[PDB]
Design a protein around this ligand. Structure first.
Ligand SMILES: CN1CCN(C(=O)N2C[C@H](CO)C[C@H](C(=O)Nc3ccc(Cl)c(F)c3)C2)CC1
Ligand SMILES: *[C@@H]1O[C@H](CO)[C@@H](O)[C@H](O)[C@H]1NC(C)=O
Ligand SMILES: *[C@@H]1O[C@H](CO)[C@@H](O)[C@H](O)[C@H]1NC(C)=O
Ligand SMILES: *[C@@H]1O[C@H](CO)[C@@H](O)[C@H](O)[C@H]1NC(C)=O
Ligand SMILES: *[C@@H]1O[C@H](CO)[C@@H](O)[C@H](O)[C@H]1NC(C)=O
Ligand SMILES: *[C@@H]1O[C@H](CO)[C@@H](O)[C@H](O)[C@H]1NC(C)=O
Ligand SMILES: *[C@@H]1O[C@H](CO)[C@@H](O)[C@H](O)[C@H]1NC(C)=O
Ligand SMILES: *[C@@H]1O[C@H](CO)[C@@H](O)[C@H](O)[C@H]1NC(C)=O
Ligand SMILES: *[C@@H]1O[C@H](CO)[C@@H](O)[C@H](O)[C@H]1NC(C)=O
Ligand SMILES: *[C@@H]1O[C@H](CO)[C@@H](O)[C@H](O)[C@H]1NC(C)=O
Ligand SMILES: *[C@@H]1O[C@H](CO)[C@@H](O)[C@H](O)[C@H]1NC(C)=O
Ligand SMILES: *[C@@H]1O[C@H](CO)[C@@H](O)[C@H](O)[C@H]1NC(C)=O
Ligand SMILES: *[C@@H]1O[C@H](CO)[C@@H](O)[C@H](O)[C@H]1NC(C)=O
Length: 341
């Protein structure tokens, strides 16, 4: 029972159904193995281990997987890409992510931090050892993290360096907030998201208080993004194959901390997309017929702190996103691959 930090090629596992035509099920059918039937972790009594969620190769390996999955499934009619115009089919596919597990080969094990207040960086006291991670839904989105896990007690603030304003902050919520997005049946690209306002604003209240704990009680100010290409300025996600862009100004600007009802965010289903996998534009086909609906859980927030506010008494935070590696980070944060012996 000796180990050291190391990186190896992992393998993936999932409860995919071989009959299902959903693209995540197909990709996991040919690319992952069945999940462990009898998994079990080994408690490491009075062992303290150092983790770093911002420098973890697991994240890059999952990222490479999700790039491959999307490359094979969600494929665009036209892909303007650094001067090329690769054209191809874009059949309306079935899209709904399933949990994926990340497993070590023989000779390696993953270490899992069970400290219920772990912030992703430095020491962990209650350390367990596993062979596979839990099932992680690979939900691509900006500004808001959806379908995710929740912090087990206090709202957790994750960052590689909180005093460096350039490094993204991940708010890990301890209570989810439902966001219910609909494109009603047949402007066929107009859509909207509904969110409970009292819930959302109570949770933003709590986030404010946490950030106060992290910033010497400086005043905390929320604002929408300041410049961006649309995938950043708007909450962008995929609903049954369609790319939704949603204005979140009503979430990051009324402050509202007589306002307490149901927030309705306007949204558009875009066709031309700035891809998150790599630089380039992808053009898909117009939306499917019928009502397109997704009821997701908001479980985390991607935030960028404003710079140059050192000599002021405020700290400004704006929703961020773009690098999906942080999206996988928000779930992989408690894991670490150690080579055995
Ligand atoms: C570092 N690496 C280089 C290439 N890259 C980009 O260039 N961008 C820039 C682009 C606009 O500027 C926005 C991109 C983005 O997040 N797109 C996106 C597409 C679909 C969905 Cl559903 C979504 F949630 C997000 C990020 C990724 C990061
Ligand atoms: C450590 O985490 C494990 C995982 O659930 C569990 O035994 C318990 O929460 C913790 N154990 C102790 C002794 O605190
Ligand atoms: C949303 O959150 C609720 C309560 O936090 C949970 O029971 C439910 O499973 C979550 N939904 C999804 C799709 O994870
Ligand atoms: C969430 O964490 C906050 C601390 O930021 C705490 O005050 C609150 O009671 C927690 N709520 C839930 C539902 O866990
Ligand atoms: C994370 O926790 C460690 C140890 O408690 C601490 O050194 C580090 O500053 C923390 N980071 C954040 C962003 O709270
Ligand atoms: C965090 O950011 C500040 C500001 O840029 C920098 O001075 C400091 O060295 C950073 N921390 C580390 C550990 O590099
Ligand atoms: C979501 O929104 C639609 C349209 O407003 C509504 O019919 C539905 O009841 C809402 N809730 C759920 C869980 O779908
Ligand atoms: C919103 O959730 C809050 C709980 O904080 C509750 O008071 C209310 O029932 C919900 N509002 C609606 C319109 O469902
Ligand atoms: C922040 O303000 C609270 C007031 O409730 C105080 O107890 C706490 O010491 C303050 N912390 C810092 C770091 O200023
Ligand atoms: C979001 O809506 C507000 C008005 O409610 C508008 O001022 C803002 O420009 C919109 N955001 C974008 C990115 O268009
Ligand atoms: C919200 O901030 C935006 C700046 O992007 C601006 O459109 C608006 O004035 C602010 N909110 C209100 C209620 O004015
Ligand atoms: C969140 O989970 C629900 C329940 O499976 C799902 O219907 C929804 O599409 C998910 N959200 C996203 C953005 O995938
Ligand atoms: C702002 O303050 C942080 C830490 O106090 C420092 O690292 C950073 O360089 C400062 N930025 C400027 C522009 O002075």
């Amino acid at each position: 029972p000796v180990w050291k930090d190391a990186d190896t090629t992992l393998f993936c596992a999932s409860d995919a159904k071989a009959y299902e035509t959903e693209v995540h099920n197909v990709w996991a059918t040919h690319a992952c193995v069945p999940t462990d039937p009898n998994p079990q972790e080994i408690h490491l009594e009075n062992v303290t281990e150092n983790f770093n969620m911002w420098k973890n190769n697991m994240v890059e390996q999952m990222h490479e997987d999700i790039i491959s999955l999307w490359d094979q499934s969600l494929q665009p009619c036209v892909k303007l890409t650094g001067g090329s115009v690769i054209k191809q089919a874009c059949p309306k596919i079935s899209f709904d992510p399933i949990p994926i597990h990340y497993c070590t080969p023989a000779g390696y094990v993953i270490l899992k931090c069970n400290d219920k207040n772990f912030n992703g960086t430095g020491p962990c006291k209650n350390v367990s050892s596993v062979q596979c991670t839990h099932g992680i839904k690979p939900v691509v989105s900006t500004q808001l993290l959806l379908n995710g896990s929740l912090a087990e007690e206090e709202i957790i603030i994750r960052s590689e360096n909180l005093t460096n304003n350039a490094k993204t902050i991940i708010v890990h919520l301890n209570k989810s907030v439902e966001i219910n997005c609909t494109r009603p049946s047949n402007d066929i690209r107009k859509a909207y998201c509904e969110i409970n306002g009292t819930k959302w604003n109570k949770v933003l209240k709590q986030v404010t208080e946490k950030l106060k704990e992290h910033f010497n009680n400086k005043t905390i100010i929320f604002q929408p993004p300041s410049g961006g290409d649309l995938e950043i300025t708007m909450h962008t996600f995929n609903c049954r194959g369609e790319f939704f862009y949603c204005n979140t100004t009503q979430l990051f600007n009324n402050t509202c901390i007589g306002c307490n009802g149901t927030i309705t965010l306007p949204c558009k289903i875009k066709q031309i997309i700035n891809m998150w996998q790599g630089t380039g534009q992808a053009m898909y086909a117009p939306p499917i017929d019928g009502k397109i609906n997704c009821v997701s859980n908001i479980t985390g927030i991607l935030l960028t702190r404003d710079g140059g506010a050192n000599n002021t008494s405020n700290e400004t935070f704006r929703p961020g996103g773009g690098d999906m590696r942080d999206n996988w980070r928000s779930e992989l944060y408690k894991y670490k691959v150690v080579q055995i012996e």
